[PDB]
Design an enzyme around this catalytic site. Structure first.
Site, PDB file in Angstrom:
ATOM      1  N   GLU A  74      28.877 -10.286   2.008  1.00 37.61           N
ATOM      2  CA  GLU A  74      28.173  -9.388   1.074  1.00 37.61           C
ATOM      3  C   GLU A  74      27.344 -10.206   0.073  1.00 37.61           C
ATOM      4  OE1 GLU A  74      29.747  -5.401  -1.567  1.00 37.61           O
ATOM      5  OE2 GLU A  74      30.212  -5.696   0.569  1.00 37.61           O
ATOM      6  N   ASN A  90      37.483  -5.948   7.090  1.00 36.41           N
ATOM      7  CA  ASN A  90      37.376  -4.536   6.685  1.00 36.41           C
ATOM      8  C   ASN A  90      38.322  -3.591   7.443  1.00 36.41           C
ATOM      9  OD1 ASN A  90      35.811  -4.337   4.384  1.00 36.41           O
ATOM     10  ND2 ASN A  90      34.278  -3.008   5.327  1.00 36.41           N
ATOM     11  N   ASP A 123      35.761 -11.195   5.566  1.00 37.55           N
ATOM     12  CA  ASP A 123      36.118  -9.786   5.371  1.00 37.55           C
ATOM     13  C   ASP A 123      36.006  -9.018   6.681  1.00 37.55           C
ATOM     14  OD1 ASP A 123      34.921  -7.191   3.086  1.00 37.55           O
ATOM     15  OD2 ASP A 123      36.264  -7.131   4.841  1.00 37.55           O
ATOM     16  N   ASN A 154      34.300 -12.821  -0.049  1.00 40.47           N
ATOM     17  CA  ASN A 154      33.350 -11.733  -0.289  1.00 40.47           C
ATOM     18  C   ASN A 154      32.930 -11.751  -1.765  1.00 40.47           C
ATOM     19  OD1 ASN A 154      32.369  -9.086  -1.044  1.00 40.47           O
ATOM     20  ND2 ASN A 154      33.287  -8.181   0.809  1.00 40.47           N
ATOM     21  N   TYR A 186      31.497 -10.277   8.450  1.00 41.91           N
ATOM     22  CA  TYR A 186      31.579  -9.213   7.444  1.00 41.91           C
ATOM     23  C   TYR A 186      31.527  -7.913   8.235  1.00 41.91           C
ATOM     24  CZ  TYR A 186      30.383  -5.897   3.734  1.00 41.91           C
ATOM     25  OH  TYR A 186      30.383  -4.826   2.885  1.00 41.91           O
ATOM     26  N   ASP A 199      40.602  -9.391   4.032  1.00 43.93           N
ATOM     27  CA  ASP A 199      39.957 -10.669   4.312  1.00 43.93           C
ATOM     28  C   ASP A 199      40.935 -11.619   4.998  1.00 43.93           C
ATOM     29  OD1 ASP A 199      37.156 -10.844   2.655  1.00 43.93           O
ATOM     30  OD2 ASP A 199      38.582  -9.495   1.677  1.00 43.93           O
ATOM     31  N   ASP A 227      34.855  -8.045  -6.479  1.00 39.03           N
ATOM     32  CA  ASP A 227      35.977  -7.136  -6.247  1.00 39.03           C
ATOM     33  C   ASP A 227      36.889  -7.611  -5.112  1.00 39.03           C
ATOM     34  OD1 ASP A 227      34.233  -4.365  -4.484  1.00 39.03           O
ATOM     35  OD2 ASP A 227      34.402  -6.525  -4.068  1.00 39.03           O
ATOM     36  N   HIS A 228      36.644  -8.822  -4.646  1.00 43.02           N
ATOM     37  CA  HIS A 228      37.451  -9.515  -3.656  1.00 43.02           C
ATOM     38  C   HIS A 228      37.876 -10.843  -4.277  1.00 43.02           C
ATOM     39  CE1 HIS A 228      36.998  -7.649   0.437  1.00 43.02           C
ATOM     40  NE2 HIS A 228      36.136  -6.930  -0.247  1.00 43.02           N
ATOM     41  N   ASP A 279      30.508  -9.895  -3.420  1.00 45.33           N
ATOM     42  CA  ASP A 279      29.980  -8.660  -4.005  1.00 45.33           C
ATOM     43  C   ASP A 279      28.730  -8.971  -4.834  1.00 45.33           C
ATOM     44  OD1 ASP A 279      30.452  -6.271  -6.413  1.00 45.33           O
ATOM     45  OD2 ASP A 279      30.512  -5.590  -4.311  1.00 45.33           O
TER      46      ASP A 279
END
Length: 276
Positions: free
Chosen positions: A54, A170, A168, A26, A129, A241, A266-267, A28
């Site tokens: 993302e 989630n 990811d 991911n 995702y 993830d 941020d991943h 971001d």
DNA sequence: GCTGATGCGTCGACGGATCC
DNA sequence: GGATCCGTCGGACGCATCAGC
């Protein structure tokens, strides 16, 4: 509290060496991530297959660097139809996939640019995702609709060919898969419903959690940390993830990493080693 | 057309109630 | 007062849109 990932195990239980290096991640924001030297990291990890989540980029506005990758010529993108700047997955492979579907074949769940199927000779790769449950859990009932439709999809696709699900997803499956389990029983990503969907998907298909299958007791193992409250440095994170494999691919499983030193997002990247 | 201002989507620190 | 359980809320991002030039 802090976590150090183990050395890469590049030989299967049977002694067979690794042949597939899939890396998911991911980013971001695909353009910010490239500005953050993300691809210099990727070049060093040298995957067979790179899956991205993302992207937040339209196939028009893709950066140029995405060309300077000579090991992943075949690149397949995917974006929401409605509006720019949201969600959106990518999949870059070294060698050309036999086939490349998109979405889970369900009109409701395909408008947002979340799923990319990719059929190969010995297996099929799905990178995803999964829709977030949202602050206030306002999108939580959508996510249940999706969970069942995605479970049903993958169950079918693993009938036809060994399945590698990555990306990811989630949710954080168990309390161990996150730093603060109790204060989040009602947060997006750790609700009873999200957690039971995953558990259900794990066995209905059936799929195995590549990492927890080799490290079933190791906590503080995190793929995502928030950027508001110092969490990453303090190692307060979630395992959002995954790599889910059909049990047929389990003897082929050399190792599953969590490359926690890789910045850009941020991943952090998660790599799979499968001996096919 | 360019440029910042504001917005949308994506939770752990802090504080207050409670029983001891 | 301290331990536990729970509820609210400021705050960081990368993207897009939009007002003010």
């Amino acid at each position: 509290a802090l976590y150090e990932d183990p050395p890469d195990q590049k030989t299967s239980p049977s002694g067979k060496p690794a042949t597939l290096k899939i890396c998911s991640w991911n980013v971001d924001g695909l353009r910010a991530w490239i500005k953050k030297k993300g691809l210099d990291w990727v070049k060093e990890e040298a995957p067979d297959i790179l899956c991205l989540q993302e992207t937040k980029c339209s196939e028009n506005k893709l950066p140029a660097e995405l060309q300077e990758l000579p090991g992943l010529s075949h690149q397949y993108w995917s974006a929401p139809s409605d509006k720019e700047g949201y969600s959106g997955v990518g999949l870059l492979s070294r060698q050309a996939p036999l086939k490349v579907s998109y979405g889970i074949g369900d009109e409701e769940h395909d408008q947002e640019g979340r799923v990319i199927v990719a059929e190969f000779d010995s297996f099929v790769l799905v990178t995803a995702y999964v829709p977030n449950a949202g602050r206030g859990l306002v999108r939580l009932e959508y996510r249940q609709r999706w969970d069942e439709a995605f479970r049903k999809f993958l169950k079918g696709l693993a009938s036809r060919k060994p399945l590698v699900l990555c990306g990811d997803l989630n949710v954080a499956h168990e309390e161990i898969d996150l730093r603060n389990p109790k204060g989040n029983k009602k947060n997006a990503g750790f609700t009873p419903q999200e957690r039971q969907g995953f558990g259900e998907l794990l066995q209905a298909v059936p799929l195995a959690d590549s990492f927890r299958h080799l490290y079933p007791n190791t906590p503080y193992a995190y793929t995502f940390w928030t950027a508001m409250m110092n969490a990453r440095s303090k190692n307060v994170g979630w395992r959002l993830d995954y790599f889910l494999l059909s049990h047929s691919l389990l003897p082929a499983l050399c190792d599953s990493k969590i490359r926690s030193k890789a910045l850009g997002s941020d991943h952090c990247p998660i790599t799979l080693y499968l001996a096919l």
